């Protein structure tokens, strides 16, 4: 098994800014035993695939619930396959909470994307109001079950825990607390082999100056990086922290 | 005062299929003095921009309500401007009725994309039940109002009337029915915005347009062109639709 670091560029970047980011990612020294993924906005995925080192695999940030057709504005998983993505981010907190995506909806995307041979970065996490109600685990478990009930296999799936409730700062102990509970849930509700093989990555706010103490935690297998992924040096330091 | 014909490819296409569609579009002869636009899925916009005749301008099919940032999965209007789009489709019936976009949400996108210098294809239209209740105009007028209240300028705005019962159903509106609504839209613009906006703004018909039925629709006084769904995926068919509006 290998640790996993994904860079979610979110809704950011231009042709010019992405040339510079690709330049700095290409010149980075990245340790070889980490799986590295970046997720550009749809428009720029071809430019990234063409000029970024093939040591880094490419993810998209979303897809539609089913095959293509009369869904203006949407991108299908078979199109993600066609353009060269190996991964798609599903259930990101911003799509759940700004954009209203519910669990059944996200579950349909996971079933369909995996059916097209695209890996899933499956995002889960609870709001501040839910943690306060002592429902951290109820919410994360309900979200995991929706992925589990839809997926044909866990082989090409990574789980990202997003402490949405922080937005204070989550401690490495609070992060590890959830990652352990997630891995336990897999053990009890899927299998022992899935529980040990599935990477569980931390998706709270992470940069090159706070990743090292999170990386030491037993059930933190890497990171889903937000804003720090827009800068080569910061991102490379996060990659190298889990090597 | 030019007619306007847009092709909405929707969620369709691969590199390979789009090569074939681009080849067919490049090989057609398009009558001059028609604004022609195609809307590829986000992934393929660069490939289209690079290899499709620059006679045809490029649209995107959606964008976010405001500037970029922490909006995973979304494309901002300044990114559309960066990549070479001159138009974005907003308020398409599929985003309203399948994906839940409401009038105010759509209006925010329209205002923001306009602020980035991207043209608007503003879609309105009524459901089968609403036409059955004789609310066609109520609904269309409310949808126009939401665009008019949000838009800080009507430069580079085109209105697309899509009778939702006609999208992908093969039940095209008759030329008489379409003309009736287009006339009402233009009168609404005359009364509620300005007579300059009313006479200048292209009002295009969407809903099962194909190479057969475009000629009689194009004859109507207030139908200024088309927003083409399924037929835009076939190069020769789309070219005959462009050529109908001369």
From TrEMBL, chain B:
Pathway named in the protein's UniProt entry: Carbohydrate biosynthesis
Molecular function (Gene Ontology), one example: triose-phosphate isomerase activity
Gene Ontology CC: cytosol
Transmembrane region(s): none
Record keywords, A-Z: Isomerase
Keyword Transferase among record annotations: no
Record-level GO BP terms: gluconeogenesis; glyceraldehyde-3-phosphate biosynthetic process; glycerol catabolic process; glycolytic process
Subunit organization: Homodimer.
Family: Belongs to the triosephosphate isomerase family.
Descriptive protein name: Triosephosphate isomerase
Residues of the full protein shown: 63 to 308 of 314
């Amino acid at each position: 098994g290998k640790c996993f670091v994904g860079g979610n560029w979110k809704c950011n970047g231009t042709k010019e800014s992405i040339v510079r980011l690709i330049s700095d990612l290409n010149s980075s020294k990245l340790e070889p035993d980490v799986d590295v993924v970046v997720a550009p906005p749809f428009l720029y995925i071809e430019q990234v695939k063409s000029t970024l080192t093939d040591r880094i695999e490419i993810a998209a940030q979303n897809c539609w619930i089913g095959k293509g057709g009369a869904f203006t504005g949407e991108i299908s998983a078979e199109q993600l396959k066609d353009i060269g993505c190996k991964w798609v981010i599903l259930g990101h907190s911003e799509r759940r909470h700004v954009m209203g995506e519910n669990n059944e909806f996200i579950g349909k995307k996971a079933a369909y994307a995996s059916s097209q041979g695209v890996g899933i970065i499956a995002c889960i996490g609870e709001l501040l109001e839910e943690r306060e109600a002592r429902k951290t685990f109820d919410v994360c478990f309900q979200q995991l079950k929706a992925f589990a009930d839809a997926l044909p296999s866990w082989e090409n799936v990574v789980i990202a825990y997003e402490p949405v409730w922080a937005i204070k700062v989550a401690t490495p102990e609070q992060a590890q607390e959830v990652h352990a509970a997630i891995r336990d849930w897999l053990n009890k509700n899927v299998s022992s082999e899935v529980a040990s093989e599935t990477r569980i990555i931390y998706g709270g706010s992470v940069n090159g100056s706070n990743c090292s103490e999170l990386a030491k935690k037993e059930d933190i297998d890497g990171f889903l990086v937000g804003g720090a992924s827009l800068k080569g040096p910061d991102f490379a330091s996060i990659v190298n922290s889990v090597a």
